[PDB]
């Protein structure tokens, strides 16, 4: 029988992703402030899931649910809370361990489910196994009821505990939990809904069902959009023991979370047929790769315990969410999928991260070159990993179409693909070498020909060295088995070689770091942009041992095991989409990015005017000039503006109606410590 | 053949307006303020309207268009705009002439296709003509372009006029015109769309193809909650003349541009079928009744033009167009239907508005009931009013079901639904001597026993007199016929003395009112709730008169003809959503109806305690350490603290939950309603 309908959650995911990365990028343009984005998620929030649940589980017939699948899910979700608070309560500090104790577990179990799990699972099931689709509004709603109220009782714990209030018992403490679950509108509406499935014979009886469609189906986008305006600030640097608790907690939900779902839904349900059974386990790792809901940071700032942890874990859960849900799923179709299919399908993966990788790739070009950075270093060396990557993804597009034609032109093909491939990978090493000689004392200048030079030609001489060495086989339908144990040994040779040359040069590096133990401001740029290239130099890192690892295990074991095929498709994941990881990297310096009288103009600096410019000049202004930056905070701090978004909004009003202007006015209003001037 | 799909339309404009009510009760709830408004706004306006329309015009096969239909339409808002156009030019004043002749054109011409049209559309059209639904995409936007840009040049001009550099010329006003209409996110994603379904063959890339169904799909909620949001302050009173000049731009966009759209498609389309030609000028015509788009006050206030009338008129549209497109779109399906189903479907259109209305009418019996101004006058027969017209809904849900069943038992039902409806009847003449017996001298003090027990009993006593004279016929469908010509003499009566009652009561608070020319705000707020009663025995009497001019003209000419079955259906709609009308009269003050420390405060206090306490209280403090909370409310948004009334609201609600401030007895939570507060 036909799988689960793998080829449309590339689409879905382009869906659930692109519409949080439209509402990223508009928070982070000021398109939609933050003030802004508390209309959409209220709409959200108070009436189109509301709307969603009740239309959802008035329909539900009841009869016919798997209730193994809800048990299953629910105790794995209950497992993982106990393994995650009882460990919280045992390791964290006696000052906030009920606190977290609380909310990690909660962002260990409460997936987002709603806004991004539905639309996942609807591509995947709806045609295949459309009575999975309800399993979302089940299981997330009952996850809620019954976890949701043992981390809120442990918050209420720490909130009692802090305030002393010592003479009052359990009664107020389980009764604030159970009073925050029931009014939540996801349990809230579940209980109105499943009473209304009773009351009604489960039809939603016409008057209504277009007043509920409408809002339920306007759901999904609007969530997204939030989702990504409520991520657009969030990624603030953390202690390194938060990035090890994040990453422990981030694990929990996307690995051991969707583990411990397949193998309990191995064990309850004991139904008949295998078929179903592997899908409805492969539904459940699917399930559990969701990332952590917003709902999860809302309470967090509810109970102002572990805000910053619980926020950038749940952005960073949302990101991570979606290689390892693409991966997964398609991992979980290849054992059930026969060799040559099996080909073009890591194939079609390839093909799909390659398309919308070379537009990041794109994108994350017109940065570098816009930006003029492309001139400085180590941008330069980062522009030519750049091209080398969408170079890759080109080649990857091209060899899709070309892999069965042109049966000697694939030789051209693979000199592009493979040879800019190697390239990605020598700039990696050459790139990290530049880290260690930024961070060395700067007269060891880079000789920047030489390693240009190296970036291009070492790979481009590597490939006409297996031209020589290989033999020709078009008939392999992968473009990295073109030319066979040949192609496989000089591709790890490349990327051992990149490898040792990048971990050498990252330690060195590291070593010059220990060692440290307008124009100022843009070098102070320049270096904390060659620390976002060593975060770019770590994931890369990864990234290659991958390929690697998985060169060596094919050439240890010429005759290739399952586990082989994991690899492969892992190495095809890395090699085409380090584009996303590059354009996840670039895409933050928002004014270098983009920019190298009205009566709401009016009334902005009538409002200042009339009012705050004394008192502004009396806190901010200094020997009649001040920082952008402190205005903003000033705004913020005085309440005229909600936020950073907003405030530089107000300071590009101010701008725009002439109260103040740039020292020398070549500048717009910007955050980024330029000075200004009144008039 | 079978019609265009009616039934799915009530449903589709609960949907629509239902979602709109949703909107405006968040935003008058302060749930969202306004803005927090803009980003469902911005979502909408930037993201999911450009999605919807770049999906919908790559998909669209040009080679299958009606071009007869978009050049009808568009000849039709072409005509309107002309009208419209020539004739604010030719009669407005000369300072604002230009202004008006922009603006008011495109207020009578651009109709909300996209929020509002095409639920509406689909849910008729869907099944029978899917071709329909791309005409909205096809209109909307073309239209926009066509028409748009003169609107534009006028208040251009205007600003050039005022502006007074007059050394300037055609280009940059013809320039600025053409700018506005480009960068518009429908104009431009329709172009790029465009091109995209020439370059793509039609084929959305399916990799993009859920991600544009994702934005899309989510416009349709999200517009129309975001139009509740952004009607929620906006119906101001206006000078007489504006709500004359009001009246006629909404008949233009609702009345005058409908009829056009469907002459123009009778002189255009020249196509064989003749049911298929008559489902497009129905089409036509409904298209025609669809609300002016809030566009249009964004382009107001982006003028900074008309901004009052035009935004005004745009919510009073809305709220216009929703019982105008139910009547439309039944009475153009009526002369395609039989006598029999015809009966059916009328009773059907009486027990959809019955039903919602006796929820809108529970809503605002709540409403009378807990504000305990059931209690005040004229509240206490308000009361009765609404109680007559719950009573008359839950008759016409009985009705509907009784009508075929327990033929002796009709006559309690019977007796049910026309006392209680002859009892609106006479609650209208009553209510409205209760207006004029108020704005006379109090000392001429209402007597309430006698007209409650008028009210009620005057009623019943007709109903009981009509079951002494008429004849029963329960195999008559409509409850209208339940006693023949006896019923439509009774009613007649009923009503030609309830409009005699409330025109001569009306008049005569009407010549009281011209001989005008805590407790105090409270009693002023019973005369301004008066004024709304106003209001209400007003569009009231012109249901009163709908409802006599039926039973006249049947009783005249008892052959009836196809102009009867036109009045006995807009009868039933004035008869059983006159709860509607209540629903929204009453549907005002808030904290009446609904009323009888966190980190986010602490800061809210710290805000106002570190910097702006003591230039506050130099403001407004006055020896009456005290304040209004309305003039507070003003300084937060003078001081721009809060953006607008709703955030004022909020602020002052935070700074009273942190104990900033409290009202002065502390029996009251934070209002803008005039009340008085103190410092700590
Ligand atoms: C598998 O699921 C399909 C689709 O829901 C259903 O038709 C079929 O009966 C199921 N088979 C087994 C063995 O459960
Ligand atoms: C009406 O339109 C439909 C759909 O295009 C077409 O199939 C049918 O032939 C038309 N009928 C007439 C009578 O024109």
């Known amino acids: 029988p036909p799988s689960m309908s793998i080829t449309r959650l590339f689409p879905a995911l382009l869906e659930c992703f692109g519409i949080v990365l439209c509402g990223y990028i508009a928070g982070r343009a000021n398109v939609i402030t933050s003030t802004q984005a508390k209309g959409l998620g209220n709409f959200v929030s108070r009436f189109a899931l509301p709307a969603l649940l009740f239309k959802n589980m008035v329909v539900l017939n009841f009869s016919n649910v798997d209730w193994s699948f809800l048990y299953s899910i629910l105790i794995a979700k209950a497992s993982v809370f106990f393994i995650v608070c009882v460990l919280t309560l045992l390791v964290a500090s006696p000052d906030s361990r009920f606190s977290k104790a609380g909310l990690f577990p909660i962002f260990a179990t409460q997936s987002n489910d709603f806004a991004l799990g539905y ?15 309800q399993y979302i509004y089940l299981v997330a709603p009952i996850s809620l009821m019954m976890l949701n109220p043992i981390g809120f009782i442990f918050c209420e714990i720490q909130k009692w505990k ?43 009886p016409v008057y209504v069902e277009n007043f509920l ?6 759901f999904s986008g609007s969530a997204l959009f939030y989702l990504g305006l409520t991520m657009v600030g969030k990624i603030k640097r953390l202690k390194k023991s938060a990035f090890v608790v994040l990453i422990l907690l981030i694990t929990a939900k996307l690995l051991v979370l969707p583990l411990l779902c397949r193998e309990m839904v191995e064990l309850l349900d004991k139904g008949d047929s295998v078929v179903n059974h592997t899908s409805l386990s492969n539904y459940a790792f699917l399930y559990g790769v969701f990332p952590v809901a917003p709902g999860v940071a809302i309470f967090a700032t509810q109970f102002n315990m572990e ?66 950075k492309y001139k400085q270093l180590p941008h330069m060396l980062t522009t030519n990993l750049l091209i080398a990557q969408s170079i890759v993804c080109a080649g990857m597009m091209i060899w899709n179409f070309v892999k069965e034609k042109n049966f000697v032109g694939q030789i051209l093909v693979f ?22 000689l930024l961070k060395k004392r700067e007269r060891v200048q880079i000789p920047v020909g030489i390693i240009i030079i190296s970036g291009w030609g070492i790979p481009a001489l590597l490939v006409g060295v297996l031209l020589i060495t290989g033999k020709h086989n078009g008939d392999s339908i992968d473009s990295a088995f073109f030319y066979g144990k040949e192609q496989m040994i000089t591709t790890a040779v490349t990327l051992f070689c990149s490898i040792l040359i990048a971990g050498i040069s990252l330690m060195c590096m590291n070593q010059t770091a220990q060692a440290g133990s307008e124009e100022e401001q843009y070098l102070q740029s320049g270096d904390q942009q060659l620390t976002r290239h060593v975060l770019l130099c770590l994931l890369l890192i990864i990234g290659l041992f991958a390929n690697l690892s998985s060169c060596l295990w094919w050439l240890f074991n010429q005759e290739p095991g399952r586990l082989y095929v994991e690899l492969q498709f892992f190495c095809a994941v890395f090699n085409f989409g380090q584009g996303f990881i590059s354009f996840g990297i670039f895409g933050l ?91």
């Not at 469609?213 to 306007?218: A, E, F, K, V």
């Not at 060799?339 to 990788?357: C, E, G, R």
Request: charge should be negative.
């Open 589 to 679: 310096d928002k004014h270098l990015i983009i920019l190298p009288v009205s009566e709401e103009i009016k009334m902005t600096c009538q409002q200042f005017i009339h009012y705050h410019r004394d008192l502004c000049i009396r806190n901010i202004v200094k020997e009649g000039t001040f920082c952008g930056c402190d205005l903003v905070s000033w705004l913020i701090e005085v309440g005229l503006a909600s936020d950073r978004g907003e405030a530089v909004i107000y300071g590009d009003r101010l701008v725009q109606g002439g109260v103040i202007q740039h020292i020398t006015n070549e500048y717009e209003f910007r955050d980024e410590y330029l000075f200004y001037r009144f008039l």
């Open 213 to 218: 469609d409408g809002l339920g189906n306007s």
């Open 415 to 436: 000199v592009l693909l493979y040879s800019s491939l190697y390239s990605t990978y020598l700039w990696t090493g050459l790139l990290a070498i530049s880290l260690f």
């Open 162 to 204: 802090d305030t002393q209030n010592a003479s009052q018992n359990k009664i107020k403490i389980v009764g604030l939990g159970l009073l925050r679950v029931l009014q939540n509108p996801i349990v809230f509406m579940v209980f109105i809904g499943i009473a209304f499935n009773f009351i009604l014979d489960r039809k939603v």
């Open 307 to 372: 805000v910053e942890i619980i926020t950038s874990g749940m952005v960073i859960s949302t990101f991570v969410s979606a290689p390892i849900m693409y991966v997964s799923a398609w991992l979980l179709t290849f054992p059930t999928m026969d060799p040559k299919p099996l080909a073009y399908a890591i194939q079609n993966v390839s093909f799909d991260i390659s398309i919308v990788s070379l537009i990041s790739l794109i994108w994350s070009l017109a940065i570098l070159l816009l930006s003029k």
């Open 119 to 133: 639309p996942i699972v609807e591509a995947l099931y709806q045609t295949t196994y459309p009575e999975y689709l």
